[PDB]
Structure formats: structure tokens, C-alpha cells
């Protein structure tokens, strides 16, 4: 027997409602509820969330990012690159009708879709040194335009790159200009990347176009044991030590023929 999706021990789970992990982390405008969330015991995501990447594309190394989250219990968002910091590029025009916010065109909240300015796109050379004591999850992206005219209008420079460097990362990315079928009315694509910036390390960004720059990153402030549970249920005012993807169960009897994936890891199962 079971009830629904409940709370675990004394810590309540993070329940993503129609939003995916990617939409949450990138700041999909349709997921504003998850700005400054508290500690969680485990994370809940639906099988097919409606709000994933408002602007279509891909999240690089997404499965290993999920495995990382299975050992993270709390984030603390911080601003590493203020949007007002961009003086040679336009930072307030990268909005799309694919990313609506209350009817108006918007974009992912934690990253900035930079645009040329004064008919020029000078080379960006920005570095952020993690002076904090915690590990830092940093997110950025690249824009793959649909055609060469779009590349010209947005970034001027026809041949562009993005360079990202840490003590462990040596990444150089070139955009792939190619015509595509439309997704969310968009024929371009946004590809996002992530890395952990260790304390006292520095991430060095360099680009002459197509750069979706970071503004907010996440401090890792607690490293317990979490899971990304796939469930359609909802909170769920209750409490247990063992939880399943289809309901909750208190006390203990080795009877269990429902699901292997269970937070709390209290016996048993077929």
C-alpha cells in the first residue's frame, strides 16, 4: 500500500512541476518558482516535463549532471557576471517568443544572450575566480544559427568561436550554421554546457560571437544523498523514512513489490 509523494525525514523534497532539471538550472522563465529554493532531500521530475528548453537545443553531458545532483542537497545561486557588466555588447535584447514570460518575449534567466553593438562584436575576454569556499556549478551556452544572414545580423563576425578554460577544462566551440526544422517556432538551436569550478580556480571565457554568457552560478552548499525521482504525483502532506516513485510507506516490513528506485534505501524488494 501507499499514499502519494510525501516528505522524507525532516527535509522536504524539491518538486519540479512541469519543469525539467535543465529548465530549473538554466532558469526557464516558465519555472520562476524555483529561484532560491531551500535544501531538499530528493528531487521530483515528471516523465515528460512541458517546460524543458524554451528555446530548443541540447544540454551537454546532461545525464552526468543528473548523477552529480544525486549527491547534492542544496544550492545557493550567486551572480558571477552582472548583466550590466557588458559595455561593448548588448545584453538586454536576447529575448524570444519561444521563451514567454507573462506574454512577453523573454529568455533563460541565469544566462545572457549577448548581441553585437555599434555594428561590432569585439572579442570577449572575461574571467571569474571562485573566491568562495564551495564548489561552483557554472553554466553557459552557444547559439547555432539557422543561416549566415542570421549570424551576420546578430554577431557581425561570420566565423566565430567560444573558448572556455579552467585547470581541468580546455573547451573550444564553433557554431554550426545549418538550416533546421522548426521547434517552438525556432530554426536555430542553443547548446548549453556546464562544469564545476573548484575554489581558487578560475574560468576564462573568450568569444567573438554566439556566446550565451553566464550571469548566475550555483554554490554547492550541501552534499548529502539525493535522487531524481520520476513521478506524476504531488505533495502530499505526509512524512516517511522510505519513499517510492508511486507512493509513500512508513514503518517497515520486508514486503515490497512496487519499485526498486526508492530514497531512504530501507529494505526490501524483489
Amino acid at each position, epitope marked *: 500500500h501507499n499514499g502519494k509523494l510525501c516528505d522524507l525525514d525532516g527535509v522536504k523534497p524539491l518538486i519540479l512541476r512541469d519543469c525539467s532539471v535543465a529548465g530549473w538550472l538554466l532558469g526557464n522563465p516558465m519555472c520562476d518558482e524555483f529561484i532560491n529554493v531551500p535544501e531538499w532531500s530528493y528531487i521530483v521530475e515528471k516523465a515528460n516535463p512541458v517546460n524543458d528548453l524554451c528555446y530548443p537545443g541540447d544540454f551537454n553531458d546532461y545525464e552526468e549532471l543528473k548523477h552529480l545532483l544525486s549527491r547534492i542537497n542544496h544550492f545557493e545561486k550567486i551572480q558571477i557576471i552582472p548583466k550590466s557588466s557588458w559595455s561593448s555588447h548588448e545584453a538586454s*535584447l536576447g529575448v*524570444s*517568443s519561444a521563451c514567454p514570460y507573462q506574454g512577453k518575449s523573454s529568455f533563460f534567466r541565469n544566462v545572457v544572450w549577448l*548581441i553585437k*553593438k*555599434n*555594428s561590432t562584436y569585439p572579442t570577449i575576454k572575461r574571467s571569474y575566480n571562485n573566491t568562495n569556499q564551495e564548489d561552483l556549478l557554472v553554466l553557459w551556452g552557444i547559439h547555432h544559427p539557422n*543561416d549566415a*544572414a542570421e549570424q551576420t545580423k546578430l554577431y557581425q563576425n561570420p566565423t566565430t568561436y567560444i573558448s572556455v578554460g579552467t585547470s581541468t577544462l580546455n573547451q573550444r566551440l564553433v557554431p554550426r550554421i545549418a538550416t533546421r526544422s522548426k521547434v517552438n517556432g525556432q530554426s536555430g538551436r542553443m547548446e548549453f554546457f556546464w562544469t564545476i569550478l573548484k575554489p581558487n580556480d578560475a574560468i576564462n571565457f573568450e568569444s567573438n560571437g554566439n556566446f550565451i554568457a553566464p550571469e548566475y552560478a550555483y554554490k554547492i552548499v550541501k552534499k548529502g544523498d539525493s535522487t531524481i525521482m520520476k513521478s506524476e504525483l504531488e505533495y502530499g502532506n505526509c512524512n516517511t523514512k522510505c519513499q517510492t516513485p508511486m507512493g509513500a510507506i512508513n514503518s517497515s516490513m520486508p514486503f515490497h513489490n512496487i519499485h526498486p528506485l526508492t530514497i531512504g534505501e530501507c529494505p526490501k524488494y524483489v
Partner: antibody
Amino acid sequence: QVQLQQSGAELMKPGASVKISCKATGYTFSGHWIEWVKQRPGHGLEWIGEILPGSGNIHYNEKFKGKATFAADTSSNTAYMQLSSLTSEDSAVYYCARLGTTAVERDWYFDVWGAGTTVTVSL
Amino acid sequence: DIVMTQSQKFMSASVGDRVSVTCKASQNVGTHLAWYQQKPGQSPKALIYSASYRYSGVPDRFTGSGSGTDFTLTISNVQSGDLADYFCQQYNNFPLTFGAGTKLEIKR
């Protein structure tokens, strides 16, 4: 709600220059590109170029690189086109127009046009 | 530069007829094409964008079709108010370019 108000007809001597204006109202002036177009009888429509007000981003049709100069005044919501070194072939109706989509979208169609400005170049 | 060719300089129609204006781009423009209507003494008006999307207020008897190089604007059930010039526009490449226009004249 969106209107484009163009300045009036002008008669110019050969070799002179003219500055025509386009006052936009009803929307965020800085979020849409302003197009400029040239229409002559017996000729197809010609694209002159493009300006995104407030950003300094300007595109010119190579055929008009020496003729046209764009500028935009965000406090006045007014876009300007200057035509220099006027010849007989510059006598035409000039339209300003707004792109229907916002600055970074891909559908560059002209949803709102001005009423046009007739330029006559003659001694 | 991409040349947009409207082979039909003129085109006749009775009220209620079905006419189609053709526009051939000299090279691929995908679906980055728009159609406009212009009556004498007036500024152009948007009809179609993205080859087949109807502009907001436009009646649904205006249909656009085609992709790549060959495009068509079809006016079904021609109405007296459709007396106008019609021209295409490609925005796949710089510079933007327009067709030379086709004049629709009503039969009588």
C-alpha cells in the same frame, strides 16, 4: 497602436543632401529594426538598409553604401535616413518600415509601413 | 544578390475566381519569404510571412505556399477589394530583395 510618421516631400538640387525622418509610436522603439526602402515607377522595390534604434547596429545594401546614412534618436523615437550626393536617379518614394518580429527573431517581414516620402532631385 | 522573379506583370480575375501569383527566387531561400499587397497611392501591407503564415488580420482566402525557389500566393474567391499590386520578399540573404510586383486587374 503602431504608427510610423514620415516627414514631408522635399525638392533638392543635384549633388545636395536630404535628411528624412520616421517617428515611431505605439511600441518599444529599441526592440524592432527599422527598414528603409526605395520605390520608383517602372522599377521594383529596393532595400536600402536597416537600423536597430538604440543599439548602433546598422546594415546597408552595398548598392547604397555611399548614398545612405542611418541614425536613430531613442529619446524622440525617430529614425533618420540621410541621402547624399543626390542625382536624378534618387528621385523616388522612400518608405520606412518596422519588422514584425523583435530584434533577434528570424522572420524579417515588414508589418508596419510609413506613408512614404517623395524626393525630387532637379535643377 | 538573390533575384526574385515575378514573371506575371499583369493578371486578370473575375470576382469569385481563383488566381495565383508566382515568385521564383534565383536560389534557395527556404521559407524565408513574405507577400505584400499595395494599392496605388498607399503603402504596402503585409499578407504572408514565412511563405505560408498569414499576417494577423488577413482573410484566410489569401494562402501562400512553396519552398526553396518556387513560391505562390493564391487568392481564392477574389473580391472587388483585391484590386492591387502583389510582390514577394526574401529575407534569407543580404541584401533583402523584392519581386517587381504583379498587377491584379478585375474582369468586367
